[PDB]
Design a protein around this ligand. Structure first.
Ligand SMILES: *[C@@H]1O[C@H](CO[C@@H]2O[C@@H](C)[C@@H](O)[C@@H](O)[C@@H]2O)[C@@H](O[C@@H]2O[C@H](CO)[C@@H](O)[C@H](O)[C@H]2NC(C)=O)[C@H](O)[C@H]1NC(C)=O
Ligand SMILES: *[C@@H]1O[C@H](CO)[C@@H](O[C@@H]2O[C@H](CO)[C@@H](O)[C@H](O)[C@H]2NC(C)=O)[C@H](O)[C@H]1NC(C)=O
Ligand SMILES: *[C@@H]1O[C@H](CO)[C@@H](O[C@@H]2O[C@H](CO)[C@@H](O)[C@H](O)[C@H]2NC(C)=O)[C@H](O)[C@H]1NC(C)=O
Ligand SMILES: *[C@@H]1O[C@H](CO)[C@@H](O[C@@H]2O[C@H](CO)[C@@H](O)[C@H](O)[C@H]2NC(C)=O)[C@H](O)[C@H]1NC(C)=O
Ligand SMILES: *[C@@H]1O[C@H](CO)[C@@H](O[C@@H]2O[C@H](CO)[C@@H](O)[C@H](O)[C@H]2NC(C)=O)[C@H](O)[C@H]1NC(C)=O
Ligand SMILES: *[C@@H]1O[C@H](CO)[C@@H](O[C@@H]2O[C@H](CO)[C@@H](O)[C@H](O)[C@H]2NC(C)=O)[C@H](O)[C@H]1NC(C)=O
Ligand SMILES: *[C@@H]1O[C@H](CO)[C@@H](O[C@@H]2O[C@H](CO)[C@@H](O)[C@H](O)[C@H]2NC(C)=O)[C@H](O)[C@H]1NC(C)=O
Ligand SMILES: *[C@@H]1O[C@H](CO)[C@@H](O)[C@H](O)[C@H]1NC(C)=O
Ligand SMILES: *[C@@H]1O[C@H](CO)[C@@H](O)[C@H](O)[C@H]1NC(C)=O
Ligand SMILES: *[C@@H]1O[C@H](CO)[C@@H](O)[C@H](O)[C@H]1NC(C)=O
Ligand SMILES: *[C@@H]1O[C@H](CO)[C@@H](O)[C@H](O)[C@H]1NC(C)=O
Lengths: 114, 168, 146, 211, 49
């Protein structure tokens, strides 16, 4: 009889004490602000239509974030752009921005002997 | 669940396992790490495009027929034909399989966005803004990068299209 | 609290944490056994007038009968009641496909020779318990009789 | 000045996993593994050798498996660090000691420079890149027909501002007059498709006439 | 990055022959790249200097 991972979705404790519980895999009928995600029943999060960027992963496209209450949403992949393609049309940059971007790479781990 | 695997519902077996200590947690922890790494791997391949570019409806790509690799408009999943071909061709004991973060439709959206950008704007949507370029001129500059002077495309464009259309 | 407890930390960073595994624990206990009304005991096995000699051990199939083993184990007669693969306290919770009862007599200090995997005159030349024996060995003094 | 306001998690995971691995290896010394005590001095005060040996063998078994787990975890995670180190060495070579034509190998946009900076157990690359900005739409053509011969851009793209035609470099709008210096000829102009008509300028033609 | 979002001068990184374009396609647990490449054909011998 049914079992699953009790996953606590939390903001930082610095931000808030409220948390939501994802009961992985189980359907909400068997669990006992209740939402049947395709990852499992999520208790204590509010379903919202607005597809924000993914803050905390849940699964199957649902993510959760704090907005104060925990909200759960199907994440957005980005804004939508037809580029106005036409067989006679070129776009050319008239200016530029020098951006300096930071890429951080591991190079070592601590040397240990036991 | 290391306890469900080793024991099932058996309080005495579960208690004996506590004497072996953190080994039950180390496995849950290591598999959690592998699991989050899979979403990271998928994101770093497909989320290279920050903006879901769309194709125009008029597919006037200079004779090149992308119909097998662009999305099918008749389908809810928005796979291409070659994606649909690929996705066709290729319990209780405490194990569980977790759903990926990005659904197959989200990977199709990203794959569509990378392809739409590529055919409508070339490299530019990668290197910044998706500056559109007519596809024949994009191919002519791709030719210029392989050391073949760009007239060799325009003077052979119907052949180059027919070779590409056949190869797809 | 479960998150704080599983991270071994009094503070938690933003995330999703697999704090616990739930299971819809069983509401009630069923018991089901065959509706066998026969009680036919080991009585004629324990209390026979003469037993077999050890070389020709008398074997009786106790079968298709209920057997309370507590009324055996409570008998103060049984100086040895060594069991293997099953424990006396639980025998009444089990049911068995067949229960062969093998009965014979041997000199007192030689009783210790009977146990599975032992060797010597009984175990070598008269009656050998297999190393994967599941069963109980019952022995009691009979100088008063034999 | 913006780097002050801004990936360290991918590096802190190294510090945090080595810490958690050692901490877990120390905590497993408290584990009994079926022995009557976790501390061997208990076994050896409580019991004499013939009984202690079985107790010690349980502790040895569980401690040796704890330590083989650690060393297996570290060997795996060291292979991951060496992948990151070889990538960092390649970035040092190709982004710092060079300029890279490899798209997104040295940050977003077209790579100019990279500067290395030391970090704890890591390297930080400040990739300086050219990101093009302020797009304008222009009408474009693959070739100009002049006097029946097809002119193509020698290095660039033909653009029209509606009225005129110009050559520009592709990645920045500097409009230049279409000339036999800025264009090259291949074939008669019937074979190309999408062609347009505009008067290419020969610098010799005015200069010779100015004699 | 190098075959879709770019064009690669790296021999064999984006198929056999000189790389033109690559198109990404999704697959189960994977990505399929359709590398479009220019392969030269119909050699003729010439004297050179
Ligand atoms: C390429 O052009 C489109 C269309 O812009 C219109 O046509 C131009 C020739 C010019 O007359 C514009 O003023 C027209 O609006 C561009 O889309 C426009 O983008 C601006 C923002 O820059 C926006 O305010 C307008 O609403 C857009 N117009 C339409 C009809 O959608 C497009 O940005 C250009 N493509 C690229 C890659 O730069
Ligand atoms: C190119 O873009 C830059 C950045 O936006 C422009 O520089 C700014 O110009 C405004 C006036 O229009 C000034 O107030 C800012 O101080 C400038 N910024 C810097 C960093 O100097 C520049 O004018 C643009 N050039 C063209 C030709 O469009
Ligand atoms: C691109 O190629 C496809 C595949 O050959 C063409 O689509 C086919 O067209 C015929 C004729 O109308 C139909 O009978 C097929 O059913 C179509 N196949 C599919 C999968 O739709 C398409 O016409 C080509 N593009 C152009 C512009 O001609
Ligand atoms: C280059 O090779 C190609 C491929 O063999 C030739 O293309 C074919 O040309 C014939 C006419 O000669 C057409 O009927 C075919 O349709 C062409 N193929 C395709 C895929 O369209 C081409 O002729 C050759 N060109 C030269 C100059 O040798
Ligand atoms: C063998 O005979 C004896 C004596 O008749 C039986 O003794 C009984 O044993 C049970 C179980 O220990 C006791 O509860 C009774 O009080 C005993 N009765 C007497 C009068 O002592 C014994 O039951 C017989 N053996 C078996 C296996 O039934
Ligand atoms: C296209 O660009 C050309 C060159 O800058 C423009 O032509 C100039 O226009 C000004 C008046 O606006 C005249 O004083 C110049 O003599 C013209 N130069 C030449 C070489 O003809 C033209 O106006 C631009 N057209 C648009 C629509 O922007
Ligand atoms: C581009 O220029 C060519 C050459 O001047 C034009 O072709 C001529 O067009 C006239 C008018 O139709 C004909 O009388 C000539 O016989 C054509 N010459 C040739 C060699 O074909 C062409 O029409 C122009 N195209 C555009 C769009 O302006
Ligand atoms: C905790 O909250 C305070 C505000 O009360 C904030 O200034 C601080 O940065 C927070 N710390 C962390 C680690 O988030
Ligand atoms: C549980 O819910 C899902 C939809 O969220 C449904 O597909 C499934 O049939 C339900 N029942 C079981 C046993 O999974
Ligand atoms: C989300 O969308 C559904 C329709 O698909 C709508 O019924 C629901 O009210 C929306 N949720 C909120 C919080 O508005
Ligand atoms: C562009 O497409 C239109 C159809 O929409 C066609 O009539 C025209 O000839 C094409 N021009 C070029 C330069 O490809």
């Amino acid at each position: 009889c049914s079992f699953g991972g009790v996953s606590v979705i939390t903001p930082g404790t610095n931000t808030s004490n409220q948390v939501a519980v994802l009961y992985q895999g189980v359907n909400c009928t068997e669990v006992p602000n209740v939402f049947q995600t395709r990852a499992g029943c999520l208790i204590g999060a509010e379903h919202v239509n607005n597809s924000y960027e993914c803050d905390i992963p849940i699964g199957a496209g649902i993510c959760a974030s704090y907005q104060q209450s925990i909200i759960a949403y199907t994440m957005s992949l980005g804004a939508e752009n037809s580029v106005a393609y036409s067989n006679n049309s070129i776009a050319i940059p008239t200016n530029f921005t020098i951006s300096v971007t930071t890429e951080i790479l591991p190079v070592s781990m601590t040397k240990t002997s036991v | 669940d290391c306890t469900m695997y080793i024991c099932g519902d058996s309080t005495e077996c579960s208690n004996l396992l506590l004497q072996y200590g953190s080994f039950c947690t180390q496995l849950n922890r290591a598999l959690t790490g592998i699991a989050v790494e899979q979403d990271k791997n998928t994101q770093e391949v497909f989320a290279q495009v920050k903006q879901i570019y769309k194709t125009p409806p008029i597919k006037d790509f200079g004779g090149f027929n992308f119909s097998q690799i662009l999305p099918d408009p008749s389908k809810p999943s928005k796979r291409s034909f070659i994606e649909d071909l690929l996705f066709n061709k290729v319990k209780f004991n405490g194990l569980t399989v977790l759903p990926p973060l990005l659904t197959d439709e989200m990977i199709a959206q990203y794959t569509s966005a990378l392809l739409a950008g590529t055919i409508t704007s070339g490299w530019t949507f990668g290197a910044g803004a998706a500056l559109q370029i007519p596809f024949a001129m994009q191919m002519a500059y791709r030719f210029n990068g392989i050391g073949v002077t760009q007239n060799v495309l325009y003077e052979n464009q119907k052949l180059i299209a027919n070779q590409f259309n056949s190869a797809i | 609290s479960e998150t704080k407890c599983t991270l071994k930390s009094f503070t938690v960073e933003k995330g999703i944490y697999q704090t616990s595994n739930f299971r819809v624990q069983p509401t009630e206990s069923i018991v089901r056994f065959p509706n066998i009304t026969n009680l036919c005991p080991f009585g004629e096995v324990f209390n026979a007038t003469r037993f077999a000699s050890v070389y020709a051990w008398n074997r009786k199939r106790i079968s298709n009968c209920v057997a309370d083993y507590s009324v055996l184990y409570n008998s103060a007669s049984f100086s040895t009641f060594k069991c293997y693969g099953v424990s006396p306290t639980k025998l009444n919770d089990l049911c068995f496909t067949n229960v062969y009862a093998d009965s014979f007599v041997i000199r007192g200090d030689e009783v210790r020779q009977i146990a599975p995997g032992q060797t010597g005159k009984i175990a070598d030349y008269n009656y050998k318990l297999p190393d994967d024996f599941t069963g109980c060995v019952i022995a009691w003094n009979s100088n008063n009789l034999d | 000045g913006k780097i002050q306001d801004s990936a360290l998690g991918k590096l802190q995971n190294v510090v945090n996993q080595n810490a958690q691995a050692l901490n877990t290896l120390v905590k497993q010394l408290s584990s009994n593994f079926g022995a009557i005590s976790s501390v061997l001095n208990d076994i050896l005060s409580r019991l004499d050798k013939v009984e202690a040996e079985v107790q010690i063998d349980r502790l040895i078994t569980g401690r040796l498996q704890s330590l083989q787990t650690y060393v297996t975890q570290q060997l795996i995670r060291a292979a991951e660090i060496r992948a990151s180190a070889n990538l960092a060495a390649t970035k040092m070579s190709e982004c710092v000691l060079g300029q890279s034509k490899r798209v997104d190998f040295c940050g977003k946009g077209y790579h100019l420079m990279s500067f290395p900076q030391s970090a704890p157990h890591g390297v930080v690359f400040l990739h300086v890149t050219y990101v093009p900005a302020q797009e304008k739409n222009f009408t474009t053509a693959p070739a100009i027909c002049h006097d029946g011969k097809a002119h193509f851009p020698r290095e660039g793209v033909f653009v029209s501002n509606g009225t005129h035609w110009f050559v520009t470099q592709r990645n920045f709008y500097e409009p230049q007059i279409i000339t036999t210096d800025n264009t090259f000829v291949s074939g008669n102009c019937d074979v190309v498709i999408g062609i347009v008509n505009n008067t290419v300028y020969d610098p010799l033609q005015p200069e010779l006439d100015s004699f």
